[PDB]
Amino acid sequence: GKTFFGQPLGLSTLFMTEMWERFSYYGMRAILLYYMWFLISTGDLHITRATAASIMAIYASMVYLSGTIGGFVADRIIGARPAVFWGGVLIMLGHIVLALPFGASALFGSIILIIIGTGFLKPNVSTLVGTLYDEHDRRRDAGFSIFVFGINLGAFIAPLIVGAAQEAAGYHVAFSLAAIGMFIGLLVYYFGGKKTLDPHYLRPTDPLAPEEVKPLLVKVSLAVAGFIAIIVVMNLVGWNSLPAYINLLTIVAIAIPVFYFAWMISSVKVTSTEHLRVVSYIPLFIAAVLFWAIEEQGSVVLATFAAERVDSSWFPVSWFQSLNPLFIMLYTPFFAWLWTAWKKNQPSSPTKFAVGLMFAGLSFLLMAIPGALYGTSGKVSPLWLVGSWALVILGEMLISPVGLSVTTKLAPKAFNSQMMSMWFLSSSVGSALNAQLVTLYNAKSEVAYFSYFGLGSVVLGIVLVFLSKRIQGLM
Ligand SMILES: CCCCCCC/C=C\CCCCCC(=O)OC[C@@H](O)CO
Ligand SMILES: CCCCCCC/C=C\CCCCCC(=O)OC[C@@H](O)CO
Ligand SMILES: CCCCCCC/C=C\CCCCCC(=O)OC[C@@H](O)CO
Ligand SMILES: CCCCCCC/C=C\CCCCCC(=O)OC[C@@H](O)CO
């Protein structure tokens, strides 16, 4: 019968829903940094550009960290389908706040709404995609491959459309276009989900038991009281600046995997065999952190280079952000044929982590060339950025599909659900690491910034190549 490229027609609803949410999110990311530059130039925002770059990095870090909790909220409390809807309302509200005739006072309110909203939506839309296929359906992998296609599709047209609207009608209209994009998504999701989505997912599939309610309430209350207490003593000591808070969220985002790691490597009930699998995974987790740190600097550091060091007079600078989802859509049909046809001697999944990290380092090493040859005073060809993005995404084609499968294969049965978080949390730690590194990038440190962090990523990819045989053997 009639399908959506061979899959049930319910996929088209979740295709549209996530395409328009990625449209709203990445359409905002393409102009949010430049919007902060504008507020700084008018004296309305009293921070430096290095701090504004840190905000962008720690913003993304909290979004991924929020994406590790929304799955628990839906599957236990509110339900997957209500989490996508109300998550989308919070995202729409976040963009509406920026569309209002406000300035810097609306930045923190808008950021919180999108952080909470994205955590409810992104994990539970992927969850609803799986619910379209009863088990044994081998169309599942092809359906998710089409789902991620709409993800990249929305991330591609958003910087082009939203960036052009900013040049024509200003920032407030451009931010309203992002809110409208989320509005189109909730329209197709609400009315489309009422026809093809299973009504069982209107409630939590694993609701709380009566004896589970009180301990969960105590657990979330102690974490809030402690986090509030940490903020209290900061202002008393005097560490009450915006870089001080960003450092706090940097520490709490990095301590979560560090505490989870020390919590896992120390337990006795795991015995020796599965204990080495956790130790051997540490070189893999740190490599994912370094890659996602480089990949997420495209919307921060590379966006700064595009506006200041590239002669892009005939088009909006924010259009460079479309290069990241463009190469993904171009690389996917090639790598889809590659991994299946390469039956002879396909490299191990740890090696793909190493080569993926080396290519992310080659992307930054490439960016050090124009500043060393021409200097940092003038403008260079826009082809330097399209070559940098081409390299870092080649590293993503090797790391992103293999990444989650690596953590699951090395995960002991007692750490499985927690090990899965370690993979998703590597994106939050990479952006948390960026919140400190992007401050070092400026006009006079361009060549050094790209050289040291680029070579350091290449060297650490060489080290993983050596350690690849030992880690694959444990699998
Ligand atoms: C449910 C619909 C949600 C979408 C709401 C869309 C809101 C429409 C318009 C408000 C934003 C445009 C206001 C433009 C403005 O005030 O600044 C003037 C202009 O020069 C700057 O762009
Ligand atoms: C997402 C809604 C806000 C949740 C904030 C976090 C507060 C912590 C736990 C939520 C309170 C528990 C509500 C669920 C509940 O009472 O279920 C009871 C029933 O299912 C079993 O007796
Ligand atoms: C599948 C693996 C892909 C690897 C691609 C490797 C590409 C090799 C060389 C690209 C040129 C290296 C950068 C040097 C360069 O572009 O300088 C040219 C510049 O001086 C022109 O004015
Ligand atoms: C961007 C992803 C992080 C990759 C870092 C890999 C860790 C290995 C080496 C890091 C370079 C250490 C020296 C860096 C440094 O001197 O900091 C200042 C530098 O930015 C000069 O402007």
Check if the beta carbon of residue 461 is closer than 8 Å to that of residue 357: yes
CA atoms lying within 13 Å on the CB side of residue 221: 6
What does the chain come to in residues?
475
Q: How far apart are CA 334 and CA 318, in angstroms?
A: 27
CA angle at residue 430 from 18 to 268, to 5 degrees?
105
Of residues 177, 170, 168, the one with CA closest to residue 24: 177
Q: How far apart are CA 297 and CA 295, in angstroms?
A: 5
Specify the ligand 3 atom closest to the Cα of 381. Answer: 22
CA 274 / ligand 4 centre spacing (Å): 33
CA 409 / ligand 4 centre spacing (Å): 31
CA 428 / ligand 4 centre spacing (Å): 19
DSSP 170-190: -HHHHHHHHHHHHHHHHHHHH
Cα 204 to chain center, whole Å? 26
Sequence spans of domains, the chain:
1-474
CA 279 / ligand 3 centre spacing (Å): 37
CATH architecture type of domain 1-474: Up-down Bundle (1.20)
Q: How far apart are CA 91 and CA 230, in angstroms?
A: 28
219 lines ligand 2 (CB under 6 A): no
Q: What is the DSSP letter of 377?
A: S
Cα 126 to chain center, whole Å? 15
Specify the ligand 3 atom closest to the Cα of 394. Answer: 1
Q: Is 8 left (phi over 0), alpha (psi -120 to 50) or beta?
A: beta
Q: Whose CA is nearest to atom 4 of ligand 1?
A: 180
Specify the ligand 1 atom closest to the Cα of 99. Answer: 11
Cα 223 to chain center, whole Å? 24
229 lines ligand 2 (CB under 6 A): no
CA atoms lying within 13 Å on the CB side of residue 408: 6
N- to C-terminal Cα separation, the chain: 42
Q: Whose CA is nearest to atom 11 of ligand 3?
A: 366
Q: Does 219 belong to an annotated binding site? A: no
What one-letter code names the amino acid at 298? Answer: G
What one-letter code names the amino acid at 181? Answer: G
Q: Does 280 belong to an annotated binding site? A: no
Look up residue 19 and give its two tokens.
């395409």
Q: What are phi and psi of 280, to 5 degrees?
A: -65, -20
Of residues 110, 113, 107, the one with CA closest to residue 88: 113
Of residues 53, 26, 318, the one with CA closest to residue 166: 318
CA separation, residue 295 to residues 246, 334, 361, 392, 399 (Å): 20, 21, 10, 7, 12
Rg (alpha carbons) of the chain, rounded to whole number: 22
What one-letter code names the amino acid at 384? Answer: W
251 lines ligand 2 (CB under 6 A): no
Q: Does 22 belong to an annotated binding site? A: yes
CA 392 / ligand 3 centre spacing (Å): 14
Q: How far apart are CA 158 and CA 164, in angstroms?
A: 10
SS3 89: helix
Strand partners, 468: none
Q: How far apart are CA 87 and CA 119, in angstroms?
A: 7
213 lines ligand 2 (CB under 6 A): yes
CA separation, residue 108 to residues 55, 57, 83, 100, 104 (Å): 10, 14, 22, 14, 8
> Helices (H) and strands (E) in the chain — how many of each?
17, 0
Q: What are phi and psi of 322, to 5 degrees?
A: -70, -15
Q: What are phi and psi of 380, to 5 degrees?
A: -115, 175
Q: Does 214 belong to an annotated binding site? A: no
Look up residue 472 and give its two tokens.
């694959």
Look up residue 329 and give its two tokens.
């859509």
Q: How far apart are CA 215 and CA 222, in angstroms?
A: 11
- Which of 291, 431, 452 has most ligand 4 atoms within 8 Å of its beta carbon, as the pocket-test mutant? 452
212 lines ligand 2 (CB under 6 A): no
224 lines ligand 2 (CB under 6 A): no
Distant-in-sequence, close-in-space partners of 79: CB < 8 Å, separation ≥ 6: 201, 202, 203, 204, 205
Q: Is 348 left (phi over 0), alpha (psi -120 to 50) or beta?
A: beta
Q: How far apart are CA 236 and CA 382, in angstroms?
A: 48
